[PDB]
Amino acid sequence: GFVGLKNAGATCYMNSVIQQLYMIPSIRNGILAIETEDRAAYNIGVLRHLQVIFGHLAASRLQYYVPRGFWKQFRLWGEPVNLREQHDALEFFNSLVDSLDEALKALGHPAMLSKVLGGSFADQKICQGCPHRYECEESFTTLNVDIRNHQNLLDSLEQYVKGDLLEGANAYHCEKCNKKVDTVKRLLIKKLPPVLAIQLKRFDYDWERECAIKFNDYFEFPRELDMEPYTVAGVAKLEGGSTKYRLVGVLVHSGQASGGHYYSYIIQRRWYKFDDGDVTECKMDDDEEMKNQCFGGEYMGEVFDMMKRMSYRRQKRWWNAYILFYERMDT
Template sequence: MCSGVVPHPLGARGCDEVEKLISIDLRSSLRDFVSIYLKILQKPRKNPQKPTKTRKNPNPQKPGVANPDWEYAPLVVNTLPGRTVANRPPDSFVGLKNGGATCYMNSVLQQLFMVDNIKRDLLAVELDGAVSMGDSGTAEEERKTYNVCILKQLQNIFGHLALSKLQYHVPTGLWRHFRLQGRLVNPREEQDAVEFFTSLVESVDDGLKAQGEEQIMSKHLGGLFSDQKICKECPHRYAKEEPFSILSVEVRSHSNLANSLEQYVKGELLEGADAYHCERCNKKVATVKRLCVKRLPPVLAIQLKRFEYDYEQGSPVKFNDYFEFPRKLNMEPYTVAGLAKIEGELVDAEENPGGAPLTTKYRLTGVVVHSGQATGGHYYSYISYRYRNGLWRWYKFDDSNVTECQMDLGELKKQFFGGNELGLGIDLDQSKSRLPITYMNWCTFCAFSIGGKLSGRSERSGWLEGWSVRVELGDEGEKGDLWLVGTRRGGNVGGVCERGGCE
């Protein structure tokens, strides 16, 4: 069960100081941002009742040289009249405020932020100044403007999640500007988390492309399907590549992920009237049509299809079937190379350029959970994070609250696998808006470097301190994100402030 974390408020400070903080130019470096942040917090309060006490430096760098991290006491900061935000508990992460029904946004944003390589690359991108969301000309220009705006909003959110001393950040910019299917979202209306994920990934990459930058989301989340047609009556086969950022698998009629993936690549036989026309033979032949993975991404997102629209009832339905998935996943049997190996065939050189070994082993690092019914409920995330000592810790990200929790096999089954078994805490009172039993909507498997063992900085903020990378060979054939070590290279880490964002 998740253990609670008690906030540690230490006073109050007005909105005016925070507004100065978030008005830093987007092109300022991350180090400048931190420096100004510290100056603001060190500034004496107006008419203080008691002097602000500073904590003793428990680990001084040098005699007579103060550690700036210990020269101030984090304070409770006012965000709205009559409301305050407590400071972030130690050894925890920053949450995200729920705008009424934006839990679907928060659960996905936290998953993306906790992938070190994604947040590192996004915050390292230098962008131009403010973007006007008014009439910008042609439809294509408006789309480019919108995509750059969403990119900047994501940089802003990631910057606050990385640096804020507060319990949570309020992503008002994203609420104001984000669109689904061309329409502005209402923060008080719940949307589908997977639809938000795919739309966000596409917009961010298009925004990067418009700025002449590398498409970061595709780099870390993008894979390639191979849509194969294998003729049974002749030696010919055809394949068409299709990019993907999330892999969707069926839940109904399957009890676990392995069975669903096996059905995924098994395909269907096209024969008779449905036979495929072989262009080389110039005739219809019985053909197996299947979809397998040609190239796996560093971070693999898998959607469990628990939601479906019932056209007879005219409303969405949710399948609460029991469905297992493992902590570790080997995707080799579902790849082009893996299937060729099983079937005793050779893999074309273009399927595996350079003859490099295919990285197919993944570890479960995140799960987005949906609690409730198809017509309404609540999203939240569970995320596993690796620390310097090599241990993994699980955290529950529930909007503004982030708590550490235990995730043994029993808890994994209780929280993620669904089903209507006794002992899972089912609440039969359907009038309650939130049921204790939870069902997984989609999960993320984080990839690890094949034959690699992480080394270097491993504290939560260690990636901020260096860009160079070092890898030591290990004994496990898994792959994963590399820790960043060494000295920070020149260049700007921007996108952490409101100014220079969208107007």
């Protein structure tokens, strides 16, 4: 079927992301089709080394490719990479796509990854105690959604639209009126990308225990997604080109906040599970299995040990979806 990627030590965060980029036809074919002084050669070398990986992923009959070249080339925000250290896979995704678009521009090409993954918000402030309204465009490569106060994607996406009331003491300063005014601040989507990448905000820091911490809360997301209710236009239609998406990719994280393990479930343009060296078949077409493998949450574990005693302990599903990739229905 497919070709894997060897893990150097703790580079599943590289693999899980690359493999997801590889499986977007537009980025695969885009990258393979390409014929401060140090930074320019760096970025091109990253693009150049990604090409090689893409080449071997298309070509090879071997079960996995070792990307020794990428590992030596890659730097994460300038500094050198310890291949035994785990890193935020999103942080890695952000560093790679910047560098690729930097590398393309540097060879007089149009910014591909920004085009395929880039959207923008209309940041709207509607003043309620005065007639002023303010908006600026703010760009995004990922949509970052709340996991701790919502149980599914649609509800957390609606939070962008609902906004926050800037009120009383915490009121918005209207520049024109020269006063504090009660005001809705919300974010609508102005430009929807051909590929919509969504981060489930599962990671944070525990002050009381001096360490990074993972929220494994239950959180569900659909196979088909309609973004119209969250767009500028859509909200205008309510208030007085394709807006539909299908799930194609799930980047999972499994284990602790500091370490743990990354892998990627992806559709064949059925579902395959890309886990470092081994790209296996899986039941992601089944909804219960989608639920157990990705939605997270608690359950009652039924523990046995030589199977003589039976314990019943609350367990966390510590394996769950971190990043969702959705493809626009006209793409």
